[PDB]
Amino acid sequence: XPGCK
Length: 5
Description:
By secondary structure, the protein is mostly loops. Helix content is 0%, strand content 0%. It is classed as antibiotic.
């Protein structure tokens, strides 16, 4: 992602 969830 990182933010990606």
